[PDB]
Symmetry: D5
């Protein structure tokens, strides 16, 4: 379904995201090459970090402790930070707005 992604430089792109892939996988499939996924989507790094629009907090599954810990390593973490590889694409995310987190 449709996700609006803002990259680090401010440019915005609408992407069509397949249900059942992770947000990280959808972003990379759409050529958002800047989103390193160094651990390969196994929740062991912070490089798939995105900032989720506050309106959408309720539409995402709860974050885990491991995801929370990894997000804390980043100096750009906010209450709305998520690891994109932890978010499964589904219809309830239709219209999701995310920003790629600044580096580190």
């Amino acid at each position: 379904t449709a996700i609006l992604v803002t990259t680090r430089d401010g440019t915005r792109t609408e992407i069509q995201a397949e249900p059942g892939l992770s947000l990280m996988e959808a972003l990379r499939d759409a050529g958002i090459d800047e989103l390193l996924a160094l651990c390969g989507g196994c929740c062991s790094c912070a490089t798939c970090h995105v900032l989720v629009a506050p309106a959408f907090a309720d539409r995402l599954p709860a974050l885990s402790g491991d995801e929370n810990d990894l997000l804390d390593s980043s100096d750009h973490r906010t209450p709305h930070s998520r690891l994109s590889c932890q978010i499964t694409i589904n219809d309830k995310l239709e219209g999701l707005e995310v920003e790629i987190a600044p580096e580190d």
Copy 2:
């Protein structure tokens, strides 16, 4: 989204499951009360344990290390075991078959 659950007594029932809920939530919502979810779906127990049909293995997100350790506590873990509170409902799961794992 239609899901076929085998309950502990071996009987099979199809349920509807809203995209974006966890499988555990979809299960309880549809009146499958067998499944305790003692930790309330926060990946801290093994009481939402399901067995997933092999044909669906690759349609689900990778299991996490925390999910994997919780499942090892169960004498009924098989390699198709999942914690259903770790699975987000989405159309790629259309037709999923799960069995409620025996108790313990």
Copy 3:
């Protein structure tokens, strides 16, 4: 409030339990001397283990991962096992039935 406690030997006792203390503290205040609380109610042992009546599962707060891990060390753990030092007494526990878990 009122808790019905069965000891290891099968004898049953009604106790009046003060709100805000833990179940372990209430049990010990009532002279259930057999319930060792070796760590002192700091969730680091399994010796305040009780079996909670299934009817009451919904009336207790969710168990944590640490409590869950410690309960797994016990060969007598069941899906309804709780560490009594993790349960805060309050009106919603009125009539709670618990059994002191067998030793280990």
Copy 4:
């Protein structure tokens, strides 16, 4: 059960809180939306962070190590900080004063 909450803007409002719910649940239920509870009350984030009036310190259960580590991630932790999803409402909390911690 009557609880006096100071919201982020410094204003004070008394709420009713049902015994057996967590403080975080009592807060949201009474329309205090300020408090995100990203992890959904499973002790895996720091977004339900409250500051408890000192006079009430000893009326609450001991904080856990997992709660303590989560709170250290916040630049606003004080020694009276608690995760409100870790506090069970009960009559001993009658008259509790809490302040919603600033964001981060």
Copy 5:
């Protein structure tokens, strides 16, 4: 690049394996579907477990502590067990012999 795999039935088949892939990926690409990778090759499960012929032990990088702990959870671990997703394919692996570990 050429690797001889002994499947669970005991039959032996030679496969080609691209350098830079993991052994797990290579086995899976060559259609050894037997071998589940529940965690997706992120070293958090034990389903990619293979048994490495003793004569190649020297040719493999040191196993890590994390890999070692996951292998101990299997009843079929031997001192030559490896997680195939931890092994990078390179020419020093020419002719490697591995057996698919039994399930669980």
Copy 6:
């Protein structure tokens, strides 16, 4: 049994301390209310932090790794910092001098 405590304001007071109690318990019983024990003396917080006069270091049991990690979370840790709840009162502690560590 006699211990000289320097409170946060810098004043010194001698207290009596029963053997077998923890230092934290003794300080609290003698009314040094300054000293919070948020975790209840279960070595899971840093609020019972005291600074031990160098001349008594030898007379105290070795600090544990867990105690060491909790002390590092305080900005006022020194190499003579101890968690007072980890210290058992005994006659070898006669005349022990401790300062209440500053907050946080």
Copy 7:
């Protein structure tokens, strides 16, 4: 101060233990050579394992999580098991009855 120790042969000695030492150190200074302290009293093995007489449980400091974990590795652990290097000798232990745990 006086400790009654039952050695592995079932025989028992009353020893004098100096306040401030650990039970492990007291035992060894009294010549109970049975008792290995492989890690040398830093809570990293289970070789200083003793069984505490039920009547004295109350008289010792709370069990730690690390001590609890180490003790679970022993086939001879009971709910009254303690690591003797974790117990500080003091007047409250006067007349303590302990038994050296069988080996393993």
Copy 8:
């Protein structure tokens, strides 16, 4: 196979690296003595730290959690940081550009 390594002085060498070795071992056999391997390549220090040229990120195996944790201890970590003892040399690394990370 050919690796272009930039040393801490900013100068750069093309080395030959034998397939199957780690990058750390390759580097050292080529005489890049700058690079300490304090723990000797068992993933327990951060002294074999290198920065991988962005174009090659894809060409390495996934980052592990342990490698991720170690790297965060370094003030010079960037999202392209890798521990060179964790990288197995293979044809897919042909022309790899790496820079030895500053010390610390």
Copy 9:
């Protein structure tokens, strides 16, 4: 430098061992090939497992928590088990008796 090494089959070589090396390193250098060192002596496996003669325990340094943890995974662990890779060769070990632990 003299070590009495008893192998799995029962043969008893005496060997010279160079100070500063690990016992595992010594056993391999003297060509005792039985002793796999799967993790390459970075204290992450149990394959360098030996049984030390009781007379010598006190002449080795204290085992670590990590070494103790690895050793407990072995079904042949005894209170005298050591990971040979963790023992630095020195003159105080003159004439040490070790047996190679059975595999697993």
Copy 10:
């Protein structure tokens, strides 16, 4: 056996050190009292911190993950920092240069 120890103030004793002892033990036995060994050499503090001369790194055994973790807590840690209690004295250390790390 000869160690060139430089203290915090800059004075440079040379000392004899007995094989089999830890470097910390040696420094204390030669009466270098600066070096607190708060945890009694069980690798749980950072107070036995020394700085090894770069010429000697390769003559010491690999540091452990645990030692590395403790050392990172020190604001004076350098890539040459070692916990002196973790270094077994042996002839290969003949003429080792160490500086006592500044406190904290």
